[PDB]
Symmetry: C3
Subunit: 274 residues, 3 copies
């Protein structure tokens, strides 16, 4: 129903080639490949073939073969098992928009599937171990969720009605899915609570181990259990300039023309601050 | 003979059907499928077939397939590679009893296999990243465990004898394996120390990131590194009542008959006000 | 790669001209490692003629529960293909990284060896599989992303690398030594060590579960917390000094067994080696 990462890349780049499967195929992979022509990879030529590596180990083996030298990433090959891997173009993850050059792990892929995330910006870097989950209801006698597997139609109706009016947003009910900005960095073993967080601002840094229970302002650096603001990456004038310029939506050419201002915040302020 | 999750479900529900394997069969699967007829899934019909998706992606595929619309969870299908998934009936994980509708990840599966856990309650929800490990010996010149691979039988015997006497339970020696109660909730990146914890009480909530180094009282809410008690979910009076009522052992029929009391603590204390 | 996997180094050392019997579903990567050898799908296996390679841990568990495994000895006659961080009875390489005997860690630390963040990991060291070791990205530019560099032309890349190599805060662990992780070190679950700011986890160090380690851990220090702080040292300053000279973790196997009384009892260790 919803285009996988691989499905989006093939639409964009397969360009009528056949798919050369590198590695042991899976049922999920074969279903995704039914509309196209595909075969077990043997001799591969990027004029004729698109290489799908099934697992990361498959990709590792393929990138080690001399036959891969003529294949360029995403344009001519991809890994099937890496829904959170970044791409050179804006993509969808389970109906969540994800910007260019943004990566995350299966925890966040799940959070996208669970409806917890509104979007993830560009050039955002999320450690694979990050976790994003909602709270369960905290205003009933039980805290379990799978208890509802035992609920009949009537029990489940009252259960849902009280979830729906709970202002603490159990299961992120009746709140906005959170936006994760562009140029965000999230370190290892971090948690973001989907019941109380709607906003991880542009440029925000979430340090390793941080348990993030409330919104992170743009370009704030938060650490600790629970996450506290340690510092801001830039002055407020530089932050508001960054929020107006939005360099993370710049074209590739634009990124290179102004590389100097991207590596020097001082020149960035100088060029764009007024 | 320690039975997988899948074997326990097949024993209960297969009901003379044939197993239809949805996905690539692994050796762990074929060892588990030994007492049953099975084939590679092609056309399936829950009248003659119980479908075993091997991986999570296999189940995703199967459930995306139109042949699945007639298959009920656990009754007619299961994922083999999810030893921690919840079930509608009480089960074993490495001979550790697990209540109904309780789920957890591979780390807690590993804890069951390592012998760290006596039992896990009903309607308990444990994030898949939770870790439960014991301490190594802390009173020896060395802290390694795998050094013992180099011990000969006599060396190993003195090593084991000191371990068995250690009051601080390295490798959880000489202590009770821990209980995890019912209606327990454990967040992401949590840790429970198997050497120093014997019980996660009924109804406890363990916050994300919490490092749990001592017993968590029933219905306590613990957070932090290390975990400390921020509050209890219910009054002192309600906790005693809950511990007597034990709704988590109720029948499905009782859960629906008394759902009003499950949904409102206020009503629960009226209904069970005089025990 | 140019570089030998753990399995490649084990076969080189012990295969001894035998055929490889594959226990489990082979992978394309495994089949490439096995290419120069005669190999086959494990049916009946005999350690005189076969070396068993289990593909996954699940396969290893299966093999070791099969009666056919009784004759096979760890590493000498069988290994797991996909356990690059597992322990070995001899010192080995993980990518460019020396790793001592009976030392294990998980894929996070494997990745850290591949990234260039680790100089060496000592002997008899135990690292929980969830441990993470990563560096900081640049903190003195307009952006913090790394994959933005996938868009850099050659000129853009050059000014980017130029500034990075001048940064005294070591983004991507630039301009610093890769960290050494000592011998007889213990690292608990959900621990993090910052490769930008740490160059040394001393011998004997204990890093507790949940710790965020932002600076060097002295030898035999016990550190906990976010950020990690020293709770105690395992031994007195004089025994630490004695341990760092004796380096029992470099001892041979017979030495370990002859001196097991000193390894078990720090007090006897001291009377013997402390001068
Ligand atoms: C936040 C981060 C990116 C860099 O911030 P920084 O500028 O280096 O911060 P500093 O080193 O100046 O630290 C300043 C203060 O913040 C604290 N601090 C910084 N990072 C912290 C963290 N992750 N946890 C707890 N405290 C932290 C320091 O203890 C110090 O405290 P003090 O000021 O009270 O003495 C880094 O610490 C981090 O977490 N990077 C993650 C790397 C990683 O996880 N690897 C891969 C994941 S993708
Ligand atoms: C603990 C939890 C259940 C909610 O409890 P709560 O009482 O609503 O928490 P509140 O934020 O309202 O306030 C509780 C107090 O403890 C703190 N706190 C709450 N949760 C915390 C956590 N996980 N870690 C650290 N501190 C926490 C709050 O900051 C506040 O502290 P204060 O007294 O010093 O101001 C929830 O925050 C949580 O941790 N859920 C984890 C979600 C998850 O990981 N899911 C996976 C499982 S499948
Ligand atoms: C660090 C550790 C080894 C125990 O050390 P210890 O010498 O027993 O220290 P204790 O727990 O008795 O107490 C030391 C103090 O530090 C605190 N502390 C100890 N370990 C801590 C941890 N991991 N996190 C936070 N705080 C901790 C204690 O609360 C205690 O209180 P105090 O400072 O107020 O006195 C242990 O706690 C640990 O982390 N084990 C690892 C389990 C694991 O994850 N295993 C899998 C790996 S393969
Ligand atoms: N190699 C060194 C670099 O590694 C990390 O960044 C990497 C990610 O690791 C990688 O992600 C992949 O691996 C993750 C971890 O397993 C998975 O979650 C994810 N789905 C998967 O695509 C992205 N593709 C590319 C990105 N630059 C660090 N942040 C970075 O500082 C470090 O320099
Ligand atoms: N989907 C949305 C729900 O997700 C989580 O609950 C889920 C579990 O995640 C899932 O678990 C599975 O996935 C885990 C994560 O990989 C594995 O560890 C585990 N072994 C595996 O069975 C259980 N089967 C069903 C349970 N209700 C949240 N707690 C809940 O708030 C949220 O509403
Ligand atoms: N079984 C119980 C023992 O378990 C852990 O020690 C084990 C490691 O778990 C294991 O590691 C393996 O599993 C890890 C977890 O997935 C992977 O990261 C790793 N790559 C993989 O080789 C090593 N081989 C052996 C070591 N003794 C505890 N530390 C120890 O106190 C406990 O007694
Ligand atoms: Cl039952």
């Amino acid at each position: 129903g919803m285009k996988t990462r691989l499905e989006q890349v093939l639409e964009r780049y397969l360009n009528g080639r056949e798919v050369a499967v590198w590695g042991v195929p899976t049922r999920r992979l074969l279903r995704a490949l039914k509309p196209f022509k595909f075969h077990t990879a043997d001799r591969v030529d990027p004029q004729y073939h698109y290489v799908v590596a099934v697992t990361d180990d498959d990709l590792t083996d393929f990138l080690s073969d001399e036959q891969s030298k003529s294949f360029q990433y995403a344009n001519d090959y991809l890994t099937f098992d890496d829904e959170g891997g970044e791409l050179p173009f804006e993509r969808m993850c389970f109906n969540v928009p994800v910007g260019r050059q943004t990566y995350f792990g299966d925890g966040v892929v799940g959070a996208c599937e669970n409806g917890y995330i509104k979007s993830i910006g560009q050039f955002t870097s999320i450690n694979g171990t990050a976790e994003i989950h909602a709270n369960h209801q905290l205003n009933m006698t039980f805290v379990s969720d799978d208890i509802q597997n035992f609920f009949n139609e009537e029990s489940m109706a009252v259960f849902q009605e009280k979830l729906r009016k709970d202002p603490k947003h159990p299961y992120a009910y009746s709140k906005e899915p959170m936006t994760i900005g562009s140029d965000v960095y999230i370190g290892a073993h971090a948690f973001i609570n989907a019941s109380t967080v709607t906003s991880i601002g542009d440029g925000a840094i979430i340090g390793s181990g941080a348990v993030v229970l409330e919104n992170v302002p743009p370009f704030a650096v938060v650490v600790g259990v629970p996450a506290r603001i340690k510092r801001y990456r830039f002055s407020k004038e530089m932050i508001e300039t960054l929020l107006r310029v939005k360099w993370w939506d710049w074209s590739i050419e634009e990124i290179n023309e102004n590389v100097d201002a991207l590596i020097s915040p001082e020149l960035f302020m100088k060029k764009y601050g007024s």
